[PDB]
Symmetry: D2
Subunit: 249 residues, 4 copies
C-alpha cells in the first residue's frame, strides 16, 4: 500500500493544512480531534477528494489511554504508519500567580506528554516498514517570554527537549525526529489570547519579512522535514517567524 | 534576619547551599521527603553557625505539601528572602520503556514544584520588598544524556518556568534565575546505571581538568542571591568546567 | 538579461560548492562557478553543468578581496544581467593551536570566510533588485558555536558569518532577499586534510553520530536547495544544523 | 598584590571595572588609545586607593602595540592575574553603506584584540599560577540591533574566541568567560543615531523596571574573576534586566 500519516489536532488550522499537504503528496491520512467533530469530518471529506484513504479518530491526546486506542485503530485500519506530526495543543493563558494545578496538568498533558506516548506507539508502527519521521509544532514561547503564555511556553520547552531525546533514542529505528517553531499566525488559536490584537499588530508591524507567518509557511517546513531531504537534521527546532525573534527594538 | 529555604537540603548540593547561606547569616528552612536522619544532622550543623533552623518534611511533588510547608515557614519565621529550588527525582530508562506514572512522578517533583513553591515564596517575599529565586538544572535540559529523558524534559520545563517567573515576578522585586551543572559525584549518580561512564567522562573530558564539585554550584547560587546579580534575570548559568563546549 | 534564474556559488570548483551548483543547474538555474586557484577543476565543473542544458559563467575571484568580488559581480551583470540565488560557500583557514596563531592567519581566514559574505551580499542585493528579490545561503559548521580542536580561526570566522547572516536577514528583508545559513557536522571531503587531527574527527563522526553515518555533501545540498526554494521564505537569519544529531550528545 | 589589566579603562565600563579591582586590592594597568587626560585622571583616582597604577597608551587594534603594552606590564609588575577585554569601537551604518575600512577597523579593535591580548596575557599568567580573562560583549552578538552590524559581528567573533580560549588556555589554569550587557547610558551610546529610542526601549521594556548601570556589569566582572567562578568556562553571562527574554 501507500504510506500513511497521522497529524494530531488536524480538524482545523496548521494540523488541517498539514494533513491536506501530505494527502496531496499521496499519503493516507489519520485526522484527529478532541471536540470539533464536524470540522474533522469536513476535513476528511476534502482530503478524500484526492483519492487517499482517511481515518478520523476522536482522541484527547492529553490522555495516554486515548492515544493507545487511536493507534490500535490506525494499526487495524492501515497496518502501518510512516509520518507523525505532533501538532495538537491547548492551554490556560493567565498570569503565573493565578495558575492552579489543573491548569498545569491540562496543558502539559496535551502539549508535551502527548508526544512521548504518541511517539512510542508511532515507533512500533514505523518499525514495520523500516522507519519514519516525527515532527512536532512549537512556538517562540518555548525559549522567550509571551504574555500570559506560561503554561503553554513551559510545555513547548518540554516538547522541544523531548524532541531531542526522541531524536537520539529513535535513530536506531530509522525514525527522524525534529520540530518547527512558529511566530504568531492568524488562526482560531489566537482567540484564546486576551491580547490577540496586540499579537497581530506586533506580527504585522515588527516582523522583518514585512508580513505575518501564514499556515502555509509552517506546512512548507513540515513537508521538508518529512521528505527524505532532511534525514540528517535530527533533534532540531527550526524557527519560522519572518525574522521576528532576531530583533530587540 | 533574612530566611532562606532550599528544597531537598538533607544532602548533596542543597545541603551545601543551605550551609553556605547560614554562614552568610540566613536562618534556614531544611526540606526533605524521606531522609529524616540526614535532614536533622544537617539542621544540627547549621544551628552551630548561630542561625535558626526549621526542618520541614514535604514531598515537593505535591502542591498540598508545598502549601503546608510555606504555612510553617510563615508561622515560624514570618518571612522568606531566598528560595533555592534544588530537589529532584526521576526515572532513568530508555524512552520506549517509560510509563505515564514515570513522567508524572518526575515532572511533578522537578518542575511543577517550582511553580507552586514560587507562588508561595512570592507571597512571603513581598512582605519585605522582594527576594531571589534560584533553581538547579543540568546539561540534560538542552543536550542528550543517556536514559535521562524524564529528568532532561523536566529540567527544560524548569528553565522555561524560570524565564516566565523572572518576567512576571519582576514587579514584586523578585529576581529569578537558574544554575545548570555538569556531572557532580553525589548520591544522585547512584540512580544512573552508567555512573562510572559519567564520572570518567567528567574526569577526562572536562577542559578545566577536574570535575565540577558541589562547592562550584553553591558558589554560583551564592552570587545569584547576593544583590550583585540583580540585573541577571531568567538566565541559566552553566557551571561545567567547559565540558559542554566540546564537540569531539 | 537571462530569461531563467541565475545562481552564484563561491568556491564551486569542488566539494559542497560544486555539488550545490550542479543541484541548482539540475533545477534549471544558470550558474556562476567561482574559484581562486583550481582553474582546471572549475572548467571541468562548468563542462559537466553545460551538459545539463543551462548556461555557465566561470569567474576566478579570491573572495578574501572585496575588489575581486566587485569584479566578479560586474562579470555576472555583463553576462547574465541578474542574480537570483547566492550561496556563500568558499572557505580557507589556518588550523593550529591558538597560541601559535599570527596576525596573517587571522586576516587570511576572516577575509575569505566572513568578510566575503558582507561584500558578496551587497553586490548580490544590487543584482537581485532587477527581479524583485532573491535568496542568500551561507555554509557554516559546528565550530561556530562549539570548540573544535585546531579550528579557532575558522570557528571564529563562522561565528562572524552566522552573526552577519542575521544582520543581512533583517536589513535585506525590505528588498525581498531571504538570508539564512546551513551548518554542517564533519563531511569526508578534501577539506578534512587541512586538520592535523583528521583521523580523530572521522572516528568521532563515524562512532558518535546518532544517525549511524557521517553527513554527506548531498545532505548539505538538500538543505541549501530547500532554503532557496520559495518553501522557506519565512525562515530568516537562522542557521540550520545538519549533523545527524551529533551536537545533541555530551558523552 | 595581584595585577589587573583593563583595556579601554579611561572612562565607562572599563574605568569602573579598574576602580573596583583597585578597591579589591589589585594593582592596575589603565589602557587608552586617545583619551590621555581621562586615563591620567583615572590613574590618579586609583592611586588614592592605595595601589600601584601603570598607564599604557595602546591602540588594541594593533597587535604590535598590544605586544609593547604587555612587555611594559611584565617589566613593571612581573605578573598579570586578571585581564578584562573591554575596549571597543565601531562604525554604525546600514549594511549597504559599509566599506572594507569600516569592517577592518571594528574587527581589529573589538575581536582581533582579544586574540593577541589573550596570547600575551597567558604567557604572563602561566608563569604565576594562572589567571582570569573576561571580555565584554552585548546583545547585538546574537540579536539584531539597528545600525550595529560591524560591532554585532565583531562581538559574535569575540564570544566565539572566548570559547576557543576557554578550552585551550585551561591547561594554563586560565579561566576565560564573557559578560554581555543590555543598553547602558555611557559615552558610547552617543555614537548611535537612535540613542533616544535605545534609552526609551530600555526604560520601558526591561522587566526589571530600570536600565542596566555600569555597576551591574562590573558586579558580574568581579564575580567572573573572583575564584568563585572557576568552573564557569567559555560562557557569556547576559546582564540585561531580562530585556532579551521578551518578544512583544
Ligand atoms: N496560531 C499560532 O500563532 C501558532 C500556533 N502554534 C502551534 O501550532 C499548533 C496548531 O495550532 P493552530 O493551528 O494555530 O490552532 P487551532 O486552534 O487552529 O487548531 C488546534 C487543533 O488542535 C486540536 N486539539 C486541541 N486540543 C486537543 C486535544 N487534547 N487532543 C486532540 N486534538 C486537540 C483542535 O481540535 P479540537 O477543537 O477538537 O480541540 C484543533 O484541531 C499548536 O501546537 C500551536 O501551539 C505555534 C506557533 C504559533
Ligand atoms: N549530581 C549531579 O551530577 C547533578 C545534579 N544536578 C541537580 O542538582 C540538584 C541536587 O542533586 P544532588 O545534590 O546531586 O542529589 P542528592 O541525591 O545528593 O540530593 C537530593 C536532595 O533532594 C531531595 N529530594 C528528592 N526528592 C524530593 C522530593 N520529592 N521532595 C523534597 N525533597 C526531595 C533529597 O531528599 P530525600 O532523600 O528525602 O528524597 C535530597 O535531600 C538536583 O536538582 C539535580 O537535578 C544538576 C546537575 C548535575
Ligand atoms: N568538509 C566538511 O567537513 C565541512 C565543510 N563545511 C563548510 O563547507 C564549505 C565548503 O567546504 P568543502 O566543500 O568541504 O571544501 P573543499 O576544499 O572541497 O572546497 C572549497 C572550495 O572553496 C574554494 N575557495 C577556497 N578559498 C577561496 C577563495 N579565497 N576564493 C574563492 N574560492 C575559494 C576552493 O577553490 P580553490 O581551490 O580555487 O581555492 C574550493 O572550490 C566551507 O564553507 C566549509 O567551512 C562545513 C562543515 C563541514
Ligand atoms: N554602553 C553600552 O550600552 C554597552 C557597552 N558594551 C560594551 O562595553 C564596553 C565598554 O563600552 P563603554 O564603557 O560603554 O564605552 P566608553 O566609550 O565609555 O569607553 C570606551 C573605552 O574604550 C577605549 N577604546 C576605544 N578604542 C580603543 C582602542 N582601539 N584601543 C584602546 N582603547 C580603546 C576608549 O578609550 P579612547 O577614548 O582612548 O579610545 C574608552 O576608554 C565595550 O566593549 C562595549 O561594546 C556592551 C553592552 C552595552
Ligand atoms: O502556541 C501558540 C503560540 C502562539 Cl504565538 C499563538 C497560538 C498558539 O497556539 C495555542 C495557544 C494557546 C492555546 Cl489554548 C491553544 C493553542 Cl493551539
Ligand atoms: O539531574 C542530574 C544530572 C546529572 Cl548529570 C546527575 C545527577 C542529577 O540529578 C538527579 C538525576 C536523577 C535523579 Cl533520580 C535524581 C537526581 Cl537529584
Ligand atoms: O569548516 C569546516 C568544518 C569541518 Cl568540521 C570540516 C571542514 C571544514 O572546512 C574547512 C576547514 C578548514 C579549511 Cl582551511 C577549509 C575548509 Cl573548506
Ligand atoms: O557594544 C555596544 C552595545 C550597545 Cl547597546 C551600546 C554601546 C556599545 O558599545 C559601543 C558601540 C559602538 C561604538 Cl563605536 C563604541 C562602543 Cl564602546
Amino acid at each position: 500500500q501507500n504510506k500513511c500519516a497521522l497529524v494530531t489536532g488536524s480538524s482545523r488550522g496548521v494540523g488541517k493544512a498539514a494533513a491536506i499537504r501530505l494527502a496531496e503528496n499521496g499519503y493516507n491520512i489519520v485526522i484527529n480531534y478532541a471536540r470539533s467533530k464536524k470540522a474533522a469530518l469536513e476535513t476528511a471529506e476534502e482530503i478524500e477528494k484526492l483519492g487517499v484513504k482517511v481515518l478520523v479518530v476522536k482522541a484527547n491526546v492529553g490522555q495516554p489511554a486515548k492515544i493507545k486506542e487511536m493507534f490500535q485503530q490506525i494499526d487495524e485500519t492501515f497496518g502501518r504508519l510512516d509520518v507523525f506530526v505532533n501538532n495538537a495543543a491547548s492551554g490556560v493563558l493567565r498570569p503565573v500567580m493565578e495558575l492552579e494545578e489543573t491548569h498545569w496538568d491540562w496543558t502539559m498533558n496535551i502539549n508535551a506528554k502527548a508526544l512521548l506516548f504518541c511517539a512510542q506507539e508511532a515507533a512500533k508502527l514505523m518499525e514495520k516498514n523500516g522507519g519514519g519521521h516525527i515532527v512536532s509544532i512549537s512556538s517562540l514561547g518555548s525559549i522567550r517570554y509571551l504574555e500570559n503564555y506560561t503554561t503553554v511556553g513551559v510545555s513547548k520547552a518540554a516538547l522541544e527537549a523531548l524532541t531531542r531525546y526522541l531524536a537520539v533514542e529513535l535513530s536506531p529505528k530509522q525514525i527522524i525526529v525534529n520540530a518547527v517553531s512558529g511566530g504568531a499566525i492568524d488562526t482560531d488559536a489566537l482567540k484564546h489570547f486576551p491580547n490577540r490584537e496586540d499579537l497581530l499588530e506586533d506580527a504585522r508591524q515588527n516582523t522583518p519579512a514585512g508580513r505575518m507567518v501564514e499556515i502555509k509557511d509552517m506546512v512548507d517546513t513540515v513537508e521538508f522535514l518529512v521528505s527524505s531531504k532532511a534525514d540528517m537534521i535530527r533533534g532540531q527546532t527550526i524557527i519560522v517567524d519572518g525574522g521576528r525573534s532576531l530583533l530587540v527594538l
